[PDB]
Amino acid sequence: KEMPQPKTFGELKNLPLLNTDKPVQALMKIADELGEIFKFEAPGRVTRYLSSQRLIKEACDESRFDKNLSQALKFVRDFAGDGLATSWTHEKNWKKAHNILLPSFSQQAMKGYHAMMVDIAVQLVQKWERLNADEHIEVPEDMTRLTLDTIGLCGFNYRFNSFYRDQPHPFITSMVRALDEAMNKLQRYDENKRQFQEDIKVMNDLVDKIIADRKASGEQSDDLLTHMLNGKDPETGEPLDDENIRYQIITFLIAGHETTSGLLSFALYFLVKNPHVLQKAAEEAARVLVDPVPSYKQVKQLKYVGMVLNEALRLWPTAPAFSLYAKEDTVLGGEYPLEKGDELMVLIPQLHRDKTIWGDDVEEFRPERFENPSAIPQHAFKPFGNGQRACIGQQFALHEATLVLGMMLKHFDFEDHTNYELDIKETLTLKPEGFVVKAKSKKIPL
Amino acid sequence: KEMPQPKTFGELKNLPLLNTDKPVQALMKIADELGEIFKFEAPGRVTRYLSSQRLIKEACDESRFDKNLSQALKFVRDFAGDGLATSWTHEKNWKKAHNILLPSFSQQAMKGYHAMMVDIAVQLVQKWERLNADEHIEVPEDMTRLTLDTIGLCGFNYRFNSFYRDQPHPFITSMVRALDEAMNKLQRAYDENKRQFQEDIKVMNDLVDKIIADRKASGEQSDDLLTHMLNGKDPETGEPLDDENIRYQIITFLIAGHETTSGLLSFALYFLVKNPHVLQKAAEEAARVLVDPVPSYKQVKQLKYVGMVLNEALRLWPTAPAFSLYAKEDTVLGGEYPLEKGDELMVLIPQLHRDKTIWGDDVEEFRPERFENPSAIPQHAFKPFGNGQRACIGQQFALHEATLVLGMMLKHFDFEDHTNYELDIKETLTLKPEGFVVKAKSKKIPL
């Protein structure tokens, strides 16, 4: 009945609890203390953080709960606009882009992105092949170069050329700074706003220019931009307009780059921390990736790598939360009455540590947990969100992560040469900050 | 360019290939060997069996292909008449009945059938609650009792009372025998069969015509399709269905819905007992969702995983396993198979549903989670209910029924595959796991 609430700060309610550089980890510790549900109040904001599969399975009932824009998403909406991730389900552009983009994010569509993914993946492999002895890999840094470039290439046939750079492409700098400013707005500035508007303008100008260039040239590529320029929503018969296409492209970059790079970085982290798991994954990569360049079909065959990725997503879902609102008055879990519009936050990493689901060894990295999706209770594993508002890029992210992880495991032995201590940097996403490895090439050509 | 074709039998071409008691499974094996398309010739008949989503998505282009009456449907038409399933799209009575009946088959309309579905479902649950220990359930037999009676009740407020009988209601016996005779004619001293066929047609017509006439005479309104058809006017023509066509619709609902839906339930329960993890997940949902002695309509809609189970059973063994199309005009299929106007296509649904390019390598595995997010299914990859405007009008009915019933079964019983049942798919015009038997230990949850 009575819902726990973490410590309050007078008028600020719980908001100062998020004024910490690891808020998800803070919320997880709160969930450790308070359990499956706690109220979290901020000025002009009430939400409830859910951590148990028992409650989250109800929160994932789309007849009762719809996606809410968290404050994070609301701030990201200032530059992702009514792209898929930052639009309400009832916004015309959400359903329109969803209908248009769903076929281009399907598992089948991954066949068409595969070559571009391989392009960037090979650049990552070659970068690491070209390291000198006793040089090391900055893992999240390289993973992010890889995911940004892959989304740039598959998203709008644009090469950020992150592997040619120490300083990222200015758009990436603007996007990352915009995300940081969105994230900074949660925990709490006149310079920030001018910087924020400048970064939005940088993002809009580049993306609008690429769209305009593509419309002017009429060139067809295997990228999402082409699909969006040619796509018509079957429902309305309407295409996305150019502004929404821009917001989608920006959204793919926001939604996909750091989540996926975090996933790769955590996966490699857990792999090097779990040599038997790494050996099994590496054995699979060697057995499956028999060609110099992985095929799409081979990536699908990287089953254990897929389980590795799911288990990394289990422990550290890199988009660590999503928000829901009660569509109508409803009772959560038979004991928490919710009024229409009441907000829920799904604390995914805590969900993924529900011992009633995963057993006592929830902290252990055991990809074998995912051998059979049917053995996993409903809504126990939500790294890609829920229902129609689930990650549209899930197949993309998993394909890219499996491909890249498979190639990494094929081509290198990895050494946790610093005995890296997991330090999870929090933006709107999670990544193992300062995770570094040494990769001894297995000298397998590409 | 050149199209594969299975082995021939001289003058009979491929027809004797269907002279087997499992023709769909034979056609699937043929499709396994020949691939996404093969020509199938019989005397005076050429068709092409399609098995890939690539080709089937084009065949499902309604601007290019219309529903064709397969030979099966042509034979069924001898007793389903110009009911919806056995009429050509251009036949006045198809569009008329379609327009009249579409609203009575909508998801919303299931609210009005729900109570009578619950009535039969409760009878099924009570039957199983009343089995003695070590008695077992003949699953497709009870599922068929369940779907016939439900369609009887929701269709025309008529109780076949199948759970009071070993020998079915004479109407059902004639219908099943008529369907059997229709199916047997595909595979072919047939003079007794012809008299029996006409006798069974007359039995079916008489009961249904009598019920219609009784209903018009009494003026009674029920929550059944018959009332809707008696009161319905096609918005386009402004006409109601006439009594003969209403009869054919009623017969059609029974033909089209009873064995497909019972087969679906039987296969779903088969896959559940063969996949304990799935069963536990489905049972958990049924227990969590169905909190009342009687499931409500809204509760059935919440049986999402039960729905996924059903879709995954439909994926593997779509119980109306094929539908037929004809090219509306000259057209090229898949960029390499030229088709002339009128050329026939058969969509081999179980093969479509095993298209590894759509579903991955594990097409044979029963994984309801494939259907966890309906967005993940490509267009025309999953066609257990046919296509377009000629899709199954009873889809919402069938799924509501099957979800409700499966949910109640999973709520009320633990199921044991006590014989380690070996899947044996009997083929009529539909598919069912023949001899599928389970033991159901009641969870002793009252109704």
Ligand code: HEM
């Ligand atoms: C491992 C990598 C990824 C993870 C963990 C992830 C996570 C998520 C989550 C949890 C959501 C739901 C957000 C919410 O409910 O508020 C979501 C939505 C979304 N994601 Fe991902 N994502 C990943 C990769 C990607 C990629 C690569 C793309 C695009 C190329 C992408 C694009 C999107 C979009 C557009 C949405 C909004 C979907 C909608 O509401 O229609 N994500 N993602």
Ligand code: HEM
């Ligand atoms: C799981 C159960 C069912 C399955 C798999 C199924 C499958 C199908 C398929 C594949 C078709 C298209 C046939 C063709 O194109 O030749 C169809 C049509 C049809 N079905 Fe179902 N069916 C089911 C249940 C039902 C039920 C319960 C009813 C009625 C209560 C029903 C009534 C019809 C009718 C009337 C049509 C013809 C629709 C039209 O052409 O206007 N079916 N069904």
